[PDB]
């Protein structure tokens, strides 16, 4: 259940990278097409129609860019989880293999050494280890 949360959480953060990567290439596509319409407006210098048209592209470019920088901080904030969520994803194969070793030491300490003192509990744990 700890790895159920990691696998879904690390899947969606790659989609956020994909949502950024969809937005990044579409940003420069609309950015380069804005300057073509800006150059075509000076070629006609219908001019008032293209002025309101290019202002709609630049406002939508701002809405793309404000979405990008909101997501870039969201990429930046959630990545600090990914530099430890992925490390605990690598650790899952390690920490599953030592359940039987650790539960042997834990169940022996929890049902047997409840009467003895600290030195004797340490000696029993050292002998079992």
């Amino acid at each position: 259940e700890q790895q159920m949360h990691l696998n879904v959480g690390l899947r969606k953060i790659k989609e956020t990278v994909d949502q950024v990567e969809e937005l990044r290439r579409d940003l420069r596509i609309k950015s380069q097409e804005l300057e073509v319409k800006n150059a075509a407006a000076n070629d006609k210098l219908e001019y008032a129609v293209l002025i309101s048209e290019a202002q709609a592209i630049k406002a939508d470019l701002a809405a793309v860019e404000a979405k990008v920088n909101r997501s870039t901080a969201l990429l930046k904030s959630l990545s600090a989880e990914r530099e430890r969520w992925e490390k605990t994803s690598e650790t899952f194969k390690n920490q599953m293999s030592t359940i039987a070793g650790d539960c042997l030491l834990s169940a022996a300490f929890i049902a047997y050494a409840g009467y003895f003192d600290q030195q004797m509990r340490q000696n029993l744990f050292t002998t079992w280890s």
Binding site: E1, Q3, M4, N7, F92
Partner: protein, 313 residues
């Protein structure tokens, strides 16, 4: 009436709900009156289909499960998921028995051949692996597929293993000899589902166009049928408007119930080579279907988080 002619009727006998994810595969118990469903929330749910009652939830896989397979005793349950693990479940104990590792990608299928000793596994890594059940070691490996091996099924005698892949091939192999007996290349798209022909259909196929025979359904909106011994497409059902997701024979060996991505559950007879009844089952993509051998019930697992049981009449 006999179990021979059984075609389901609208509406659903039951509409089981409670999955938090799309439902990938649904199968019936061979002897008991309970069914088990698999869904993408890594929860293997057990529902009583007679009364529509939820029974239990087995959570051992740490990623989304794709295919679940019983044995004919009904005691062992094989489950595959995308965590590089396969899980063996004691059905009478409702706990896991062993976990299998060795696949490097999504284990897209799992099955048990009728000898009751091993486990088939088709996966995304373009290979099929053989698993020893009681010991727990990966023994053999079918190699030769070039794309995503979608789903695998063994023959009823346990001597033929057939697998569909994403490279528009249906590859039928022998279990130990490791050769591709039939590399059928006639489908236009990714073949997503096969269904082994029963014995009673072996005559019915042979007079429609002996044995053994094999079905396949692909993303090209076609369901082809093949003779394994010859190696060619005998007959083809067209009439689906989207990807055929699950193709299934009747238990008596005449009809073929098939689900496709256009919200269609269509029954097809190879005598007329057409669709007689089309059922609008769910409100979204329908992934898998299953029909009982002795009971008049068809269960349908779909993406819309509901599993629908339909009485056959």
């Amino acid at each position: 009436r006999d179990p021979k002619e059984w075609i389901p009727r609208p509406p659903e006998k039951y509409a089981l709900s409670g999955h938090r994810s799309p439902v990938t595969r649904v199968i019936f118990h061979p002897v008991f009156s309970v069914m088990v469903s698999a869904s993408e929330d890594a929860t293997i749910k057990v529902w009583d289909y007679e009364t529509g009652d939820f029974e239990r939830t087995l959570k051992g896989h740490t990623d989304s499960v794709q295919d679940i397979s019983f044995d004919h005793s009904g005691k062992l349950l094989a489950s595959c998921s995308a965590d590089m693990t396969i899980k063996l479940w004691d059905f009478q104990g409702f706990e896991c028995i062993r976990t299998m590792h060795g696949h490097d990608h999504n284990v897209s299928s799992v099955a048990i051949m009728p000898n009751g000793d091993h486990i088939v596994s088709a996966s995304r890594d373009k290979t099929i692996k053989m698993w020893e059940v009681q010991t727990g070691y990966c023994v053999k490996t079918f190699t030769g597929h070039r794309e995503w091996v979608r789903m695998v099924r063994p023959n009823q005698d346990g001597t033929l293993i057939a697998s569909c892949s994403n490279d528009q091939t249906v590859r039928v192999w022998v279990v130990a000899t490791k050769e591709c007996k039939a590399e059928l290349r006639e489908h236009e798209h990714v073949v997503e589902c096969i269904s082994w022909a029963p014995e009673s259909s072996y005559s019915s196929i042979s007079e429609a166009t002996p044995g053994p025979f094999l079905l396949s359904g692909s993303r090209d909106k076609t369901i082809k049928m093949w003779d394994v011994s010859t190696g060619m497409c005998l007959m083809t059902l067209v009439g689906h408007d989207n990807w055929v997701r699950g193709v299934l024979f009747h238990s008596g060996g005449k009809f073929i119930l098939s689900c496709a991505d256009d919200k269609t559950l269509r029954v097809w007879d190879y005598k007329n080579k057409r669709c007689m009844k089309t059922l609008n089952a769910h409100e979204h993509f329908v992934t898998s279907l299953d029909f009982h051998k002795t009971a008049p019930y068809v269960v349908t697992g779909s993406v819309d988080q509901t599993v629908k049981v339909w009485e056959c009449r």
